[PDB]
Amino acid sequence: STGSATTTPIDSLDDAYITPVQIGTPAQTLNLDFDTGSSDLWVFSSETTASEVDGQTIYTPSKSTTAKLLSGATWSISYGDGSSSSGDVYTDTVSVGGLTVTGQAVESAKKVSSSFTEDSTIDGLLGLAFSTLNTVSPTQQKTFFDNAKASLDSPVFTADLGYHAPGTYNFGFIDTTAYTGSITYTAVSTKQGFWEWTSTGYAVGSGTFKSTSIDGIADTGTTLLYLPATVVSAYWAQVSGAKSSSSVGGYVFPCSATLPSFTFGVGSARIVIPGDYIDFGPISTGSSSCFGGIQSSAGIGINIFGDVALKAAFVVFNGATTPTLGFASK
């Protein structure tokens, strides 16, 4: 079996992307934030504290005939953004782009953070990291991808994020129609439970490429590109007016300025993010300070290849057990 679903970003800066998903019987469709750096499928729900639900669409597990309590089961997550969520767990039929998975753990929130509560578009998260991360106690649960894998023609999915534009999540197959040239597959370390890989270096604009291993995670769940202090210094040094700010908490530049592109090495191949991608606009409404899309990783303890980087390449999460991350141009 295969499935493809259209993912659409949620505002003009492409802060996150949402993918529609069918849960229950009959079907309740929720826009989920596909997160390859977490391992929980959770949704706003019926149980969710009504001081904490907005225009978000809610999962009502009393209207699903496929839906059942996982009695005693409980979850609690923390995000690198400080994000906070928790509640109790159900098992229901979940469909993505016509790939049905039965008896999927659907983790219904009783409690959600300010972050999620102020986020109209997003209705919950679908984690596509490795199952060792999933938070549910006391019987730890599996991902949607974990549940789909054997049913799949191939045990892969692809991520093809758009810049100011929808794109696609494909499960089971690779569109040889979506990318240009060759896919360069690189080794994945599954130890931390991340899509965790080792980049072969970088260049800024038309500069010379420095060979140097950057260990980072592929994370569709993070907006920005998080790199180490050395690398991000060399980038923003090429932008006149670019400074690191105490208050705002990150590199800003003047909006009138010019972003030179960023290149990252995937073995022998090279992926340009063009400089357009790195402009995340003004720090506040009216401000002529704009916010940069490449920030230092020094404060979080891992380097994250988030949307800025992934949305410049056609990525493939090979979920074999020699698991392999592929990049191509698009």
From Swiss-Prot:
Occurrences of domain Peptidase A1 (ranges): 17-328
Reaction(s) the record says it catalyses: Hydrolysis of proteins with specificity similar to that of pepsin A, prefers hydrophobic residues at P1 and P1', but does not cleave 14-Ala-|-Leu-15 in the B chain of insulin or Z-Glu-Tyr. Clots milk
**GO terms for MF:** aspartic-type endopeptidase activity
Cite the EC number.
3.4.23.22
Broad class of enzyme this protein falls into: hydrolase
UniProt-listed GO biological process terms = proteolysis
Entry superkingdom: Eukaryota
Active-site residues annotated for this sequence: D35, S199
Question: Keywords for this entry?
Answer: Aspartyl protease, Disulfide bond, Hydrolase, Protease, Signal, Zymogen
Q: Which cysteines are joined by disulfide bonds?
A: C255-C290
Q: What family does the database annotate?
A: Belongs to the peptidase A1 family.
Protein name (Swiss-Prot/TrEMBL): Endothiapepsin
Q: Tell me what organism the protein belongs to.
A: Cryphonectria parasitica (Chestnut blight fungus)
* Lineage, top ranks: Eukaryota, Fungi, Dikarya, Ascomycota, Pezizomycotina
Q: Which gene encodes it?
A: EAPA
* Residues included from the entire protein: 90 to 419 of 419
